[PDB]
Design a protein around this ligand. Structure first.
Ligand code: CHL
Ligand code: CHL
Ligand code: CHL
Ligand code: CHL
Ligand code: CLA
Ligand code: CLA
Ligand code: CLA
Ligand SMILES: CC(=C/C=C/C(C)=C/C=C/C=C(C)/C=C/C=C(\C)C=C=C1C(C)(C)C[C@H](O)C[C@@]1(C)O)/C=C/[C@@]12O[C@]1(C)C[C@@H](O)CC2(C)C
Ligand SMILES: CC1=C[C@H](O)CC(C)(C)[C@H]1/C=C/C(C)=C/C=C/C(C)=C/C=C/C=C(C)/C=C/C=C(C)/C=C/C1=C(C)C[C@H](O)CC1(C)C
Ligand SMILES: CC1=C[C@H](O)CC(C)(C)[C@H]1/C=C/C(C)=C/C=C/C(C)=C/C=C/C=C(C)/C=C/C=C(C)/C=C/C1=C(C)C[C@H](O)CC1(C)C
Ligand SMILES: CC1=C[C@H](O)CC(C)(C)[C@H]1/C=C/C(C)=C/C=C/C(C)=C/C=C/C=C(C)/C=C/C=C(C)/C=C/C1=C(C)C[C@H](O)CC1(C)C
Lengths: 219, 219, 219
């Protein structure tokens, strides 16, 4: 319970090998000291890796929640068409464009190339202004700004804020691994991941993983 | 990102010809140094042009939003009759006067000459009191007053206020150019501009502009 | 028109953001300052990237001309069999080995493992002697030697030689991007790229790209 210090929860716990690599000793969230290959020895490259991992973690968390929500919403009391995240990308082609919420009173996007061009414009703008700053105050911090992106004001107390940093990083790692699980389930079985959840909760041991283990057999 | 200074985003960027005309060097929003004819060499006439351009920009922005909103509102979930801005001016003549929102429980203006006379009276009053001041404090500034027209109080911090000035001017220029586009679409094809939007999004390249290029052919 | 200097044609030209990364300011061809990720901050690794990009550029230019020539030659007045670069690699297996120019009086390579072994021997020799030098004078420059590889003598005048450097790098970048296009056309449509050229020149807009956009649809 001492991540910011030498007594952090190390990568093997009581198999910790307390001779840790000296280029990271606490002082940054998520430092669990698991460097078996050591691709981040250089400090500026290490900083790039911190920024890159933060970006990956936030994007992956957003995608993971986006993979949990719509299927459950369409399973509970709404209808989307194909709420499973495979053909949600092809819902614009099928019959009447991509109707949001499965309702012909919402977005109803007919042409995907318009989404394409506007998306490129907006994403270029937001990513450029993410790197170099811009609106809502010029960006002075590349890792965590501290400017008007926290309209509630939770970043006053420092140690709870650092605990929030560590929770953010751990949640992002879990989100990245879980989205890898989503992608592998997309490959192997190619069905709904929450359909997978229901089917495994209905079938705990008879259809576990290895009925789907003789599919990609070369011959 | 330095509009208020010699390092403003000039009219050609890195084709800037940094020998700019010396009668404008920053210190005013929208100064992009593009004076190829030079019709504003005199300083008082230049001030007139700043005031005139501000008036044109605000009026054109109002008109542009007025050209985007009603068609979308009548396309989504309401009905107006002719929501396209052509015969919206003739909606008072058709059958039952100009019913607002397409509802016979709202304005229901029967005689257009009454709108005419009251509009002249009100417009004369508001423009005279715009020039020379009057209510809500006497007008001491012709460009931006600073009196009780900003009930929220966003004009405290000066540099963000200047950035707001520049955004206002750029939005006004875009609005003027876009309303010119609206007028040219009114002339050439004479159909709904958002109907144009939907048709070009449905037809990106087969009906682009030059099917409507052999209409005004003299003979 | 000033690549060797601060006034180079930067990556956005008129959106240049003249605060360029300081680890490259001219003095080398192809320096267009477009470092959004920054994977070449280290100077020796940057040198490796210059050498590597030169090798890639020359190899890709050779491959690109090798992808333009034979199809056109077999389309104009000669015959090769499959002049399209797909089965040109399998022309040794088909009936009578790989006959050069489509003529049974030229190379007529029967066994591909002989080409294989001789190719490995020759390529190991030339690549080793490329790295460490050797014949025709020992290699003293890893980037551009200056020894007897320019039997015409165009490297006397320095500024024209530097312009040749920049042309070489730009041609190489274009060749790499174009060969990527060749590979993507090999994947998606799997037909002749110059057959693609003729078909798009015959069909400019009816078969553009998105008839070939519903092929790799998962289900
Ligand atoms: C449109 C312009 C645009 C521009 C200029 C940038 C620019 C940038 N982005 Mg951004 N992005 C843009 C659009 C978008 N980005 C993202 C998502 C991200 C993420 C998630 C991240 C960035 C990052 C970055 C930075 C460097 C990334 C890089 O080197 O890419 C090179 C990479 C590729 C060309 C593709 C790499 C694919 C990857 C290997 C996936 C491999 C998949 C797995 C192996 C598993 C696959 C399936 C499963 C089942 C096994 C750079 C500033 C990174 C960053 O800021 O780090 C500090 C970062 O982490 N961008 C999305 C969402 C789709 C965009 C949509 O338009
Ligand atoms: C109190 C009555 C009154 C009303 C209803 C209006 C309303 C208007 N003024 Mg006005 N003004 C009024 C008094 C005054 N104005 C101004 C100075 C200005 C300016 C500079 C501008 C307006 C503009 C406008 C228009 C849109 C404003 C948003 C609209 C016609 C704007 C306009 O006409 O563009 C649409 C505009 O640019 N007013 C002064 C001097 C301080 C006034 C003093 O009585
Ligand atoms: C004498 C045998 C010899 C042969 C047949 C080649 C032939 C080749 N060299 Mg090489 N080289 C040879 C010796 C040497 N080269 C080089 C330095 C280079 C460089 C820097 C490059 C070549 C490249 C090439 C290729 C195309 C050249 C045109 C081709 C593989 C180019 C390449 O591989 O791209 C296609 C390339 O960029 N050579 C040196 C050091 C001075 C050599 C000394 O013996
Ligand atoms: C036979 C022995 C042989 C030896 C010892 C070398 C040795 C060397 N070569 Mg050479 N080569 C040899 C044969 C050949 N080379 C080349 C072509 C090249 C090129 C083009 C380059 C070198 C380079 C190098 C140097 C380091 C490259 C490396 O790290 O590879 C690791 C790489 C791989 C194992 C394969 C990488 C594949 C790559 C990722 C392709 C990805 C494809 C795209 C994503 C797109 C694909 C399809 C499209 C449609 C999307 C190294 C001195 C590089 C250099 O000198 O840089 C300064 C360099 O740029 N070699 C060819 C032509 C096929 C050879 C044929 O025999
Ligand atoms: C691309 C995503 C990515 C990136 C850049 C990083 C980056 C980093 N991680 Mg990290 N991590 C990730 C995903 C990622 N992580 C995921 C998904 C998990 C959960 C499994 C973890 C769990 C983890 C732990 C437990 C620790 C780190 C640590 C680190 C730091 C040092 C290690 C390093 O140099 O990594 C460089 C990484 C790369 C260059 C990415 C290479 C990716 C290629 C494609 C190979 C991946 C193949 C993979 C092994 C096959 C199975 C995939 C499956 C497991 C998902 C560095 C900031 C250590 C640290 O000190 O934290 C700050 C540490 O203790 N990570
Ligand atoms: C009538 C509207 C109007 C007026 C009075 C001004 C006034 C001004 N603009 Mg301006 N501008 C406008 C509309 C207008 N603008 C629009 C719509 C755009 C976008 C295309 C711009 C883009 C623009 C830039 C990029 C710059 C200016 C600048 C200036 C200032 C110096 C130039 C000058 O003396 O203009 C005098 C203008 C007139 C006397 C108007 C004459 C109008 C007649 C009918 C001719 C128009 C015909 C037209 C060319 C045909 C195509 C129309 C189509 C492009 C819409 C001055 C304050 C410069 C500056 O320093 O900013 C402060 C500068 O750098 N403007
Ligand atoms: C592998 C090929 C390769 C390599 C090693 C380089 C290397 C370099 N380029 Mg470069 N470039 C290339 C291909 C390549 N280029 C191509 C094909 C284009 C045309 C699109 C360009 C256009 C370009 C510009 C405009 C600029 C550079 C610059 C640079 C330098 C700094 C950037 C850097 O660190 O790159 C490191 C690169 C790599 C480590 C390669 C990673 C490759 C992986 C597979 C990711 C690629 C995925 C790709 C984005 C997906 C779409 C591919 C499609 C666009 C082809 C460096 C010497 C900058 C400079 O200063 O020039 C000297 C600069 O301004 N390049
Ligand atoms: C109206 C008109 C305009 C011409 C436009 C041109 C010439 C565009 C070419 C435009 C071509 C241009 C600009 C190319 C210019 C090349 C340059 C600058 C070279 C360069 C570079 C860079 C950037 C690498 C930078 C490097 O560091 C230095 C340097 C020097 O290497 C033509 C009309 C006619 O063609 C018709 C219509 C019908 C005919 O019958 C009659 C006529 C009159 C001839
Ligand atoms: C550390 C280390 C160390 C040692 O030394 C070495 C090694 C081992 C190599 C290393 C490792 C590495 C790794 C593992 C990595 C991984 C990563 C990942 C997983 C990522 C993900 C990542 C991921 C991510 C980002 C994701 C993202 C996502 C997204 C956006 C999504 C989207 C979406 C959504 C919403 C929904 C819809 O409907 C669809 C989609 C489209 C689906
Ligand atoms: C700068 C310069 C420089 C150089 O040197 C020379 C030159 C070139 C000459 C110059 C230029 C100029 C120009 C271009 C100008 C333009 C302008 C414009 C466009 C305006 C508009 C302008 C415009 C405007 C105001 C507008 C306004 C509008 C409005 C009110 C509207 C109204 C409406 C609405 C609401 C709706 C309904 O249903 C109808 C209507 C009725 C429709
Ligand atoms: C710069 C940067 C920056 C930022 O920061 C980040 C990023 C974006 C990542 C980066 C980028 C990168 C990139 C893009 C790369 C690319 C590359 C390429 C494309 C290469 C090619 C490359 C390519 C190449 C070499 C090629 C080569 C080729 C060859 C040999 C060929 C051969 C051949 C021939 C003759 C013909 C026959 O019949 C067949 C064949 C076999 C076909």
């Amino acid at each position: 319970i001492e991540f910011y210090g030498p007594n952090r929860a190390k990568w093997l716990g009581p198999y910790s090998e307390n001779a840790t690599p000296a280029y990271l000793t606490g002082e940054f969230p998520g430092d669990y000291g698991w460097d078996t290959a050591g691709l981040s020895a250089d400090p500026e490259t290490f900083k790039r890796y911190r920024e890159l991992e933060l970006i990956h973690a936030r994007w992956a968390m957003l995608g993971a929640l986006g993979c949990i929500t719509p299927e459950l919403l369409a399973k509970s009391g709404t209808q989307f068409g194909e709420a499973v995240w495979f053909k949600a990308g092809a819902q614009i082609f099928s019959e009447g464009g991509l109707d949001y919420l499965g309702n012909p009173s919402l977005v109803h996007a007919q042409n995907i190339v318009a989404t394409l061009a506007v998306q490129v414009i907006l994403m270029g703008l937001v990513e450029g202004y993410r790197v170099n700053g811009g609106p809502a105050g010029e960006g002075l911090d590349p890792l965590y700004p501290g400017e008007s992106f926290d309209p509630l004001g939770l970043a006053d107390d420092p140690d709870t804020f650092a605990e929030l940093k560590v929770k953010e990083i751990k949640n992002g790692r879990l989100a990245m691994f879980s989205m890898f699980g989503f992608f592998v389930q997309a490959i192997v079985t190619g069905k709904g991941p929450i359909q997978n959840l229901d089917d495994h909760l209905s079938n705990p041991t008879v259809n576990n993983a290895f009925a789907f283990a003789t599919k990609f057999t070369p011959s």
